Design a protein around this ligand. Structure first.
Ligand code: FSV
Ligand code: FSV
Lengths: 228, 7, 235, 9
């Protein structure tokens, strides 16, 4: 209704202005778990208000808005972390005061496995030299796409427009037609890996549930219950 | 749900 | 060192066959019966996939260990996208085999199977809406094989190779679309639309992976040794 | 491993 009526630069500045802030945090197993889950809960609140600014997201009904966020919240959370940790190789920047190691991931059962996947993604972003304008596009794509199948013509229109926006950035960067196709493909293939980390992260999160280690906030348990 | 209220 | 047509014909020739099941539509299905059929079918399809994988342009150039890794990570994905492709012109149904056509309702014969059914059905519906082509299908299937495990990997210089053929399949996909008479914009969007499906296919795979893992622990139907091997790669 | 074998064939 309104999102389709933007230029790509209007689309980019819309996304860049809506960017959530970088939060801070306040090691044993339960201690590091308390930190990360508390951080995730606070980041979740910002994401929701960020989601309400992604062009065309408001045009969807409240139920569909809920579904998409229920499906992609851990993905969006992860691609943000991967983006922060971009210029801290071998490390994950959960917060400016919380920079973690692959070795520190061994403080929690099965955490190190997901750490390496996150580290590998951050390394990949560094290798591709991902731009901030490209980052906010992918993050928006995940929001609109990750839950669009488990239900639409409008969401695809918005999705197609972000694709146009992505290409505009690359063509602006002086890339040949071929380089644009390949880079576009390279980017969207990452989202397949990010989905994989989300699902692996989802069940690991669920294993700390039931088998209680640290209590989880009600908002966090709600998002976690959407995935069975 | 609380997610509704935030939205 | 191939053209896109040479690339497409290479993929189209390497296409695995459509197998049948021992299913006999004279008696209804239980939980363990339908489970035996699907897992027996998946095991036989697995064998064909492996020999299909060895024909994907550039796959042989990889070491045996990397070949193992990629197939370990994407076998259920490649499996599922094949089903979704077969069930394309059978709306509301899943064509596991020409003699095994299943309903959403029949998926409720197994605990938690119906949920994965709808996702598969939704993907099949999406392919129908996009009007996916066979040339496009064999490209995506090759993409999944090369991409799904390329991240979970010193010296190497092999990843750089994997992205090279990956980029070449991207070129191949675009050639098809441009050949079809699509505008530059329509090519970008359709390319994007296709690769976004793979995100959903990965999701079904992970959900499917944990499902038949429960069956291995719930001990409902025996699983072939090859199938249990592919399943243990995912913990 | 079976996959280890089946690919070598
Ligand atoms: O394996 C696990 C297990 C677990 O309980 C949580 C996580 C991730 C937590 C997280 C917190 C804040 C972020 O910005 C983010 F991207 C991820 C991963
Ligand atoms: O030949 C094919 C092809 C194909 O795409 C899928 C399957 C079966 C998938 C499957 C098997 C057992 C489960 O418990 C499950 F959830 C899914 C078999």
């Amino acid at each position: 209704s309104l999102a389709l009526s933007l230029t790509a630069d209007q689309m980019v500045s819309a996304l860049l202005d809506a960017e959530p802030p970088i939060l801070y945090s306040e090691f044993s197993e339960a201690s590091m778990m308390g930190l990360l889950t508390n951080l995730a809960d606070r980041e979740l609140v910002h994401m929701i208000n960020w989601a309400k600014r992604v062009p065309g997201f408001v045009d969807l009904t409240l139920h569909d808005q809920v579904h998409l966020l229920e499906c992609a919240w851990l993905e969006i959370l992860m691609i943000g972390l991967v983006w922060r940790s971009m210029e801290h190789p071998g490390k994950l920047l959960f917060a400016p005061n919380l920079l973690l190691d692959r070795n520190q991931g061994k403080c929690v059962e099965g955490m190190v496995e997901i750490f390496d996947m996150l580290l590998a993604t951050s390394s990949r972003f560094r290798m591709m030299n991902l731009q901030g304008e490209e980052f906010v596009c992918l993050k928006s794509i995940i929001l609109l796409n990750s839950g669009v199948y488990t239900f639409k013509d409008h969401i695809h229109r918005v999705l197609d427009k972000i694709t146009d926006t992505l290409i505009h950035l690359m063509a602006k960067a002086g890339l040949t037609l071929q380089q644009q196709h390949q880079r576009l493909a390279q980017l969207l293939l990452i989202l397949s890996h990010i989905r994989h980390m989300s699902n692996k992260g989802m069940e690991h999160l669920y294993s700390m549930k039931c088998k209680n280690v640290v209590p989880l906030s009600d908002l966090l348990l709600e998002m976690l219950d959407a995935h069975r | 749900k609380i997610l509704h209220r935030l939205l």
